[PDB]
Amino acid sequence: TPSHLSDRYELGEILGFGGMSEVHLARDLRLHRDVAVKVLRADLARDPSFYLRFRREAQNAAALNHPAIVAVYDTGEAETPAGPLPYIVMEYVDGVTLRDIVHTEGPMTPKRAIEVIADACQALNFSHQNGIIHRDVKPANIMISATNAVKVMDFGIARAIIGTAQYLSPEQARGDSVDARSDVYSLGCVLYEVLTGEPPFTGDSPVSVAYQHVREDPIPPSARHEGLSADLDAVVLKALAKNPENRYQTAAEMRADLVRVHN
Ligand SMILES: CCn1c(-c2nonc2N)nc2c(C#CC(C)(C)O)ncc(OC[C@H]3CCCNC3)c21
Ligand SMILES: [Mg+2]
Secondary structure: OOOEEOOOEEEEEEEEEOOOEEEEEEEEOOOOEEEEEEEEOHHHOOOHHHHHHHHHHHHHHHOOOOOOEOOEEEEEEEEEOOEEEEEEEEEOOOEEEHHHHHHHHOOOOHHHHHHHHHHHHHHHHHHHHOOEEOOOOOHHHEEEEOOOOEEEOOOOOOEEOOOOHHHOOOOOOOOOOOOHHHHHHHHHHHHHHHHHOOOOOOOOOHHHHHHHHHHOOOOOHHHHOOOOOHHHHHHHHHHOOOOOOOOOOOHHHHHHHHHHHHO
């Protein structure tokens, strides 16, 4: 992790990190603008099993051009003493995730949660229309900028044409085929959690959470948290239907129903 990548992007403070990658705030010295740079860890940057996933993340994200989807600007490899260092240059979102918001400020107001999630539906529907399934819809992958613009990010496991158990769908868990309606389900879990302050199913173990996704129906949000209408309950519970046929068939359908509740 040198000071500059290709004598172009001067890395700044770290914004976040996971098991395989990290994300820095950086400065594009040619264009004189702030960008975010996602870097593949050198600790295990040799394994082509990762190298392909990282390159494929950059391509899937770059295939999408949408205001609610973090934009990819560039990509390459930085020459380092340890070897080649892959990196993705992308739009910098000066904001916080829904995970941070719920953890520090508790559930959102119904009016706001509907607007944020309705914007996320648009991003996902656009992705689905272009043949890319996110697979990792969760509160940590949706951002709200200082502009209050919603930004979906982290395509790291997106499929063209696993995630956290509390947000997996009955089909995404257990390896079955996943389609747009699987992202809808995950988005329903996100909506459930920004409204009530907790996801629909918690458990001491992953198999405990997975089992509930398949067999147990969710507690209606209005029962978990006050100030929640019965019309919002229906939207959330339809997104959390067990059978894909009963869910919203597209993220756009889910958004249309959220607008009805708002208005
Ligand atoms: C660190 C936050 N963060 C950001 C940005 N933060 O400000 N501007 C950003 N852009 N982008 C990502 C991506 C990505 C991607 C593409 C679109 C190229 O696929 N993946 C992951 C990120 O955090 C990881 C989260 C995950 C959970 C805990 N650590 C923080 C990102
Ligand atoms: Mg993430």
